[PDB]
Design a protein around this ligand. Sequence first.
Ligand SMILES: Cc1ccc2cc1[C@@H](C)N1Cc3cc(ccc3OS1(=O)=O)OCCOCCn1nnc3c(C)c(ccc31)[C@H]2CC(=O)O
Length: 288
Amino acid sequence: GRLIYTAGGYFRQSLSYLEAYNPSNGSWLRLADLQVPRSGLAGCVVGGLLYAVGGRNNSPDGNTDSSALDCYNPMTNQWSPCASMSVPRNRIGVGVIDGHIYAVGGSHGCIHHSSVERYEPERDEWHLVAPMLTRRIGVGVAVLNRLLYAVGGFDGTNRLNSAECYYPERNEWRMITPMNTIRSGAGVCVLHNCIYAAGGYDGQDQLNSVERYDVETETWTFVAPMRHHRSALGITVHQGKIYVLGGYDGHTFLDSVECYDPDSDTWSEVTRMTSGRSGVGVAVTMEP
Ligand SMILES: Cc1ccc2cc1[C@@H](C)N1Cc3cc(ccc3OS1(=O)=O)OCCOCCn1nnc3c(C)c(ccc31)[C@H]2CC(=O)O
């Protein structure tokens, strides 16, 4: 894996862009568009292939929540459809455990899901697993030590500071320590032994604060805030650093890409996306 891929997003309407950033030389490549423009989707990688999951096609012709799973192969620069999920999931969170994709929460119209389902690429099948204890849309999801975490979000009435963990061998969800901040549409990732929650929306403001959950201590601690307040940001980890892409700051759909170095506890601007956007799906895989 060597490029940071950003798929979809929103700027005036849902986007079909697939673009890839090379941290080693600062270059951006524009690759094959998604077959359907989608915002509020998630991206992930299994076996070197990039998957785009869920989202919504917000267009002048009609708004449709997506149950789609599409696969991009960097060796061919082509997207291929996969089996669709049981239900549409806009503002979804996804995590990968042992080659399986877990699709978590998200919305279908006014329905805010607590349901979760798992995709097996070798069978091209989805199956429902135990639902979360809380309905969550705009939920951040990360995997640490083969355990799946669902962080923050919106339950249909309130934005959440709560978080929960899924234990696959017990098919059970249990609440973990809540975050110090309410966050919906935060960027959630894993770095070292911690789950980071960056930015998001608390129901009033877009946030620049960043906190991390240490799974051995069960505590959330704030780290250095980002240079920009961002909600509905893309996030990924590459070579021990967190990269945040775009998002909305309450005024502009950002093109800013910042990088967090955990050793210095500093955020730096590293590049700008080709255009400002929010609600993207991000993941790292081999160059095309
Ligand atoms: C992916 C995603 C996750 C979480 C949220 C929204 C979205 C969707 C709707 N994206 C964010 C977005 C934002 C936008 C237009 C399109 C758009 O499309 S998108 O990029 O796919 O305009 C923002 C105008 O400010 C409203 C206040 N605000 N700021 N951040 C917000 C967020 C994060 C949510 C809700 C309201 C938010 C939350 C939902 C909530 O808490 O209710």
